Point group: T
Chain length 161, copies 12
């Protein structure tokens, strides 16, 4: 049948190249945050090492799930993610993480900055993504929420009051 | 009480008949997708049968949770879902699923089309739902995301590259 | 060596009549599932929560049941039809009403529909048993499970 | 780096005092709903006591997770929650819950009203929150959905049909 | 079209008084077995105490699950179980368990005999139950299997070469 | 250097009076378990499901209770008797009636049964405490759990 | 037969004084929970994460505690009052400050407030024990749990 | 009063014919398990992973099956033989070939193996049922599970 | 309203030196028991090896949980535990566990005696502990119950008829 | 930059025929052990039946996990396992398990001897395997540890004083 | 007493060469993880789902591996570098292509890249072993795990 | 045909030198466990909670370690001694001090204790490896886990 469509080939929602590009921006920063998070996780030393060591893993977990979500959202919308090391290094907006052992206080500031850069990328892209596909913008909202929570849980260590 | 409201009867948000109708459209297609998913799950044969057999169940799981979510969202907003077989058959927009055993390749195309029809119903209704109640549109966004992911995981089997 | 010679050993195949009997069971289990969910959402009134929850348990059982029967058909070279049009046209269950319904009414309605489903299974049981006792064993589980659901639901309306 | 930002101090999104105030409104009503939920949970008596006793705990669970989510969302955005008893009592919009044992029927009406007041606070604040930060409005949508579901699961007990 | 039945009061399967009485016989022996299993579990002493102590609890779990199953099957089929202590003591076919402590060797023989007696009751009513209701006989088959396995696990302690 | 030089250090032995006191608790816990299941099966009427479920929770608690008490007796070298004949002959709980009973009747009956069981524990509490505080602590656990079950069950019939 | 005659056996009822004592414990446990959550969100500075997490554990315990006490009141026919107005007006705990607070300050503040809560429980303990040792046993668990939380929190600020 | 007065109540003993019938089932289940693992390791080609995984599920089912049958024999005082020499000498299943095999070949080979195993169970079913319905019920479970595995495996090669 | 106290430094319950010394006595015997339980667990041989091997690990788990509980209760009450090996060896009241392999029968008697001794220490300090702090005495009650149950589970292997 | 290799077909480690034959020897004894362990598990009777019955299943689980590990290691290294019944019977070094029921004491000695033989095969090929592939030898080390632990847990039943 | 005198006992320290060797292993494990995820998202064609899933399992293993090696470096006073620039500049793995790729191609590509990763581990193995066998034991686990992944992936493309 | 014809195949026996070497490892693992709990209870000051928690993880690892070593000794028919007197008399670990200790002091003390324990394992490693590689593999596991704990603990005091 009464209301049954009779088409044999019904196509899905396809992302525009601009939309694909916007998600690619989010993906590389998520991946760069994950790699920097692990680097910090390994090389942090000094007062309250353990809390930071542990919290940094939780951040990485969240960042990894985020990258997988974004990349697979691209696939669903017929876009093609690039999460390769050369691409991430050449295109990330995140300030470089320093080499060697870094103190807990330094790591807190460094990582907070890098989380904030990552969230800023999502925020800058948010409205263009929403205008085309609110469902994908809803995924961005989850990323913003979780990442900004991580920033709070990490930065609070250095707060002097 | 200081700031306490003094009303004994405070009423909740009620859905308009248009809104109720829009959710009913989503519900029957979700249910029809679930029934067609099981039909495909049982009758698929041929190369890569198992992967498809398994993925089709995952689709059904998602579609069933979606229908329950939508129907109960209607109840919360004082609307009345109808998920009975006669209603679903008479009102679904999904193209009919064929009888008998179907090859893996045929099932992939058939189900992808039917997922896409279901998502299209949600997409067509999305803006009217959002305008009245953003919370319900947020539920739709979850459905769009999950269903379009299922389409990608299923259709990729037939992609020639 | 007692090893067999054949390179192609075939499995048990069901008769058309056998397939037809399981199809009868299948459509009534599916119908019961859909009616179960309908009642689950639309029940209101005294002791709403208990019935709301129990009906979800009835649906779970019915859905497991339909999958089991349809896949039994597949194992025996029969082809199940669980599509909405077929279910609607061939189910023996009394139609479940639309709209909100009282707990008391939902109890009576659902009990009747569970019983109709059990009746289908019971009336194909012997013919199924005669051909394949292992399938009849599957039917026995459904009879037990559904009749238990009937008891758990109908007891709400029992007086003294 | 090639695209790497060179800033050492990148700041996060900060909530305006208006935004902070709006979340504080949601927080105190969530907390007051939790406290009233427990009061009802303990003191409800009469026909269908158990179902209500159990459902009221589920409501409290949801309300508690909601308050923690909102308060921590404030922290992330550099706002400062106040969930202390004096503040909650002096600023909640929820009508007072009565003392002593109350019948199941009375508790159903009382709690439904109080859930509805809580949701109304979220709904009244929703658009201002969305305009500043869609991610936080997405959190509100989850609260609206869950709370309105609780209202349906509780109020249906008293529905005469 | 429509194969739909038109009756509004379709009745369930009702057991005959004889059938009910046969399941009642099974029920009381299963309960008696549970009580005796617990008695032995507490009061066994001697070589290999722990194994028998533990195995006896597994017997009791099986027997308890069994009695609940049979009792509820009675209820489903409109029969009325009597599992009260006075009835169990007055009607069980199981020989009494002796008082005070018993050796491991004696407990093995005693409990094995009581399992045998319990299975014997189930086997005695099996054909009559099967004739009326194959589904209930199937439940009996499970009890027979499970109980005879317990008998083997317990009795094998005393079997020599 | 602080090590004791006995080879056979004996443990705490319960007196036979203590054993009999725990024996009183044990039979009433077992009787409650048996009556709880009878109610669980045979309850019918308004709010069946809630009572059906709550009665199983009570039985779970009472079954754990009787195991704890019997094993506490064994730990202190007393010997429990939880056999059917003994339970029926020595329990202080009023007999549970035969046949199906309404939810309202089952609420009143079971509450009385729980209260009789708690009373037995309260009656022996101080004599048990005087000999062995640790055992009285176990009794305190039972008192708390049983009285909670009494409250959760009786509330169905309370009118305000 | 040792079976009792009564059809209506009543349970233990608490005195008004007893109910009042548990109410005192209830409001301080609730206050501690709310203050615990406040501190949990608003703590900042050195070793933030450890205290953030520990304070959530303190809240969990306090919430379990309040539910346990309030439901104990219900079991014994007493009526709990856990509403925000009542809690604010009748709690003995020093007010917890608004706004962000250093880890060191939060440690001192929360320790003091845990101790005030333990003090309430300790000062009603004997009067509760004299009437109902099973309730006093519940109080013992709270004393142990909260005093353990006090140790785990305060140790952050301990010097040498 | 209804209590039996024997001290040595004997249980149900299986006849030696029954034992041998279950012995036939046992060796084919064990052979299937061994051949299932060989296929699991040595399968290669298009859709390797699915078959690799499904073959392990089949082996799981067959391993549980042989334990169930051997222990059922023991329960009825029969004595199982699942030793390698016995299995190889008395199994009715066609030998599995050596070396790596394509997924298509493995599908055909394993399906034939499953079908031969089910045939053994179907051959002895009625003689087993005549002596002990409960054991035949176990056979029904095996028939259902094995034929399902046959369907899940063979479907990879079906062309429509 | 206000019943609020106004002190900013409310002190916790401090144990007397005598009380601390009494819990220290319990602690060392619990640790000694754990060490001896492990020794027996490794070194027992003979009839019914496995049961005792397994039961001894359950004893050790209980004793370890016990020592941690007592030690931490000391800390909570401002006392300082000493669970170091030298102290445990120099101050435990438990008779030494013999070296090398011991028969199952001997291990049963040996360990039972050592549990009895451990419980005896707890019973000796019980009243003095109860007089100062009923809450700590309650923890002792749990140790008494648990340890005496272990004693029964172990010793019953050697009890005859 | 760049240390990247430029080959498009990089080969994996291939085992020599001798290496493959050595793992095949381990495989058949592990399978034979599993089959014999199950035989004993079913057919053991007498004092301490239950413990041995249970311990034998733990042996079988270990041996089964072992054979799968060795077989798959063969596959990874391009060798081809033969775990067929005829091959296992014709090539195993394990002495045959006797038929029918055996006493607990006999099963202990019999199974201990068969574990010893299985470990002996693994120890005989260990150095030759280590010389070619240390990673496979490491897998052998795990089998040696696990099997010799099982031997101790089983054999200790028969060890006296 | 056999107790040592020192108040400061130092742990095993790795040589610069040792640290360098583990760094080589680290960057290739990280590269493999990133390439694994790339393939996981971008694979299309026949048997997509199996490879999609297996590649996620390869990534899980590689990520556990890199964490293990980097933390082993930290334990031995070496300093890991897992940053994207360093990984890209110093990895020995052939570059994985951008864009969609067929299952067959992804199988070949990933197998080659797994093998390149295993080769790095194998070529530092002896030098690592000579200095610290416990670290070489960790390398053995990676060799086993990755070579198992290579088998599970490459078997899709194997003919006859 | 390949079957061995001995009836008493003996297993691998450890030499007494090997046994004593594992005995050295065992006492230091037990001492570490005991000292770990002392630190766990008595640590106070800045970052108490982290150290309190990490010290329990170390004890968990060391307790599992000593069980593994003692049971490995038993497997090879050696006989362990983990009694208090033996441990105190033969351990090589420096005595842990009495009384409360600051987190900083506890970090230094425990790290030294871990390092002394690892040193014992490293000292006996090659003699153990020469007789039985499988046991040396167990030692490798201990070395890895203990040194990781050393790194996770010491890092609290590291200044850069
Ligand atoms: Cl933590
Ligand atoms: Cl899969
Ligand atoms: Cl419920
Ligand atoms: Cl066991
Ligand atoms: Fe993924
Ligand atoms: Fe639902
Ligand atoms: Fe299925
Ligand atoms: Fe939180
Ligand atoms: Fe039940
Ligand atoms: Fe027990
Ligand atoms: Fe509660
Ligand atoms: Fe088994
Ligand atoms: Fe602890
Ligand atoms: Fe496998
Ligand atoms: Fe890590
Ligand atoms: Fe152990
Ligand atoms: Mg910390
Ligand atoms: Mg959302
Ligand atoms: Mg949104
Ligand atoms: Mg596949
Ligand atoms: Mg049957
Ligand atoms: Mg059956
Ligand atoms: Mg209810
Ligand atoms: Mg035993
Ligand atoms: Mg007490
Ligand atoms: Mg207590
Ligand atoms: Mg090694
Ligand atoms: Mg290793």
């Amino acid at each position: 049948m009464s209301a049954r469509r009779t088409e044999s080939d019904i196509q899905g929602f396809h992302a525009t190249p601009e939309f694909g590009g916007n998600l690619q921006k989010v993906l590389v920063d998520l991946i760069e945050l994950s790699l920097q998070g692990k680097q910090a996780h390994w090389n942090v030393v000094g007062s309250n090492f353990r809390d930071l060591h542990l919290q940094l893993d939780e951040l990485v977990d969240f960042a990894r799930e985020g990258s997988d979500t974004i990349a697979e959202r691209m696939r669903a919308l017929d876009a093609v993610p690039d999460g390769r090391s050369d691409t991430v290094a050449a295109t990330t907006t995140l300030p470089e993480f320093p080499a060697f052992e870094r103190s807990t206080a330094d790591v807190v500031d460094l990582i907070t900055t890098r989380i904030n850069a990552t969230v800023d990328t999502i925020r800058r892209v948010h409205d263009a993504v929403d205008a085309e596909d609110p469902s994908t913008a809803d995924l961005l909202d989850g990323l913003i929420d979780g990442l900004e929570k991580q920033a709070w849980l990490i930065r609070s260590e250095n707060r002097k009051v």
